[PDB]
Paper text:
Here we report on seven crystal structures of [name] at low and high pH and with different heme ligands. The overall fold of [name] resembles that of other NPs. Eight anti-parallel β-strands (A to H) form a barrel that hosts the heme cofactor including the ligation by the proximal His60 residue. One of the most interesting features of [name] is its ability to bind to negatively charged membranes.
However, no significant conformational differences were found between the X-ray structures collected at two different pHs (5.8 and 7.8; RMSD = 0.22 Å), even though this might simply arise from the packing of [name] molecules in the crystal. Overall, these findings suggest that the ill-defined heme density of the unliganded [name] reflects the movement of the cofactor inside the heme pocket according to the two coordination states. However, packing effects also explain the large structural similarity observed for the different ligand-bound and unbound structures, although such a structural similarity does not permit to rationalize the effect of deletion of the N-terminal residues on the binding affinities of certain ligands nor the pH sensitivity of [name].
Author numbering: 2 to 185
The structure:
Amino acid sequence: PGECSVNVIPKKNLDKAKFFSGTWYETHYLDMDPQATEKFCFSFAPRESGGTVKEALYHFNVDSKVSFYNTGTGPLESNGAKYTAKFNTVDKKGKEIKPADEKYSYTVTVIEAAKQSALIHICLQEDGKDIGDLYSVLNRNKNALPNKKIKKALNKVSLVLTKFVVTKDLDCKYDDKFLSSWQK
Ligand code: HEM
């Protein structure tokens, strides 16, 4: 029902220092629930050290004009391109406003990365059971189109970019300072 996709393959030999740096913007996304049709914008700043990922997350609800901020922490898998995190809720200043709920986690897989582009998959879980998943194309630049390598990776798993929501058209509002100041 809320079962996460199979055939999500972590990139071989991801350059960690490059991927886990700076800010990434979602440019296209595909929620695997066809009824999940609310428009959102997303950006994040993932960092890694000693086999642990610490990331700052930003979402913006286009419909309601409400933004929310989270941080996530968890171990990086031995393959170096997949991690599972627990998360809390913070305000725009980075201060915790709601503690992590033990029953929830998410698993991010980096499927492909090339130049200024990447393709990721996220699986949300409750008590270790799948509750839903999503694919996202990322770019360093809000308005940029994906590298062909990202399209190749989509093709390998029988997805086509035309099915994704494109957010550059949406009235996105970003908190870039929250992400740029992450772990500063
Ligand atoms: C790229 C496109 C993405 C979209 C469109 C999206 C959309 C959403 C939506 C609609 C919600 C629920 C908001 C609500 O209940 O009002 C949500 C929650 C959440 N998402 Fe995303 N998401 C994306 C990517 C990600 C990624 C890549 C991560 C982790 C790296 C992530 C982590 C979370 C977390 C932790 C929550 C729950 C926050 C809370 O309950 O306080 N999301 N997202």
